[PDB]
Amino acid sequence: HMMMAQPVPYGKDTLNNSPLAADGSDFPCKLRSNTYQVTEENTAAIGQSMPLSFIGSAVHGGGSCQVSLTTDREPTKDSKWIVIKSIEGGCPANVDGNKFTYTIPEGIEPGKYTLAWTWFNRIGNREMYMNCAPLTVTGSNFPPMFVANVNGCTTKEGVDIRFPNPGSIVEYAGDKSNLAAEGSQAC
Numbered sequence: 601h602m603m604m605a606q607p608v609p610y611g612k613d614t615l616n617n618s619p620l621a622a623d624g625s626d627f628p629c630k631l632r633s634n635t636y637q638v639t640e641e642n643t644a645a646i647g648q649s650m651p652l653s654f655i656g657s658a659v660h661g662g663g664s665c666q667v668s669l670t671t672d673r674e675p676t677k678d679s680k681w682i683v684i685k686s687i688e689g690g691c692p693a694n695v696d697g698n699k700f701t702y703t704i705p706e707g708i709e710p711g712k713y714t715l716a717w718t719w720f721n722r723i724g725n726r727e728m729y730m731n732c733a734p735l736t737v738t739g740s741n742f743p744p745m746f747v748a749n750v751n752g753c754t755t756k757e758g759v760d761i762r763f764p765n766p767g768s769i770v771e772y773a774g775d776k777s778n779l780a781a782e783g784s785q786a787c
């Protein structure tokens with residue numbers, strides 16, 4: 601169980617480290633009282649490295665994550681999300697104990713967006729974690745975001761999944777021996 605600390609999520613005060621409900625009832629963004637309350641607006645220039653960091657009680661052997669954008673500031677189940685980074689393996693970390701960045705790429709227009717971090721844990725229950733944050737891209741090719749484990753598509757335990765459509769910005773941070781094969785079916 602983990603949650604995003606940077607960028608600062610919407611509704612930080614009520615955001616917990618639980619995965620999305622298995623029945624899809626709180627997709628997207630962990631629908632609740634104040635799902636889309638701006639705690640702190642996050643701001644990024646195109647091409648600027650931005651920190652992506654996480655806190656929680658178990659990394660579940662890592663797994664794979666995406667960072668995605670939508671123009672909707674109150675996304676619904678029908679929102680269009682586009683991927684700007686995939687991390688296949690090693691996300692959010694490899695081990696528990698007492699690192700990542702993203703960049704807004706050329707092709708994203710200045711404006712206000714919602715950013716989502718999504719995570720498919722390697723080990724344990726077949727879950728999807730998702731936290732959303734307000735992002736302003738200052739100044740004012742990208743595939744659809746992968747969804748599994750909350751929509752009847754179930755991933756395989758033990759592997760760092762490869763997203764069918766990872767986009768052109770991909771990082772690998774896990775053990776090569778756990779990485780699913782290129783072209784493998786994720787669910």
Ligand SMILES: [Cl-]
Binds near residue numbers: 656657658695
């Ligand atoms: Cl941990």
Ligand SMILES: [Cu+]
Binds near residue numbers: 601602658660
């Ligand atoms: Cu957990």
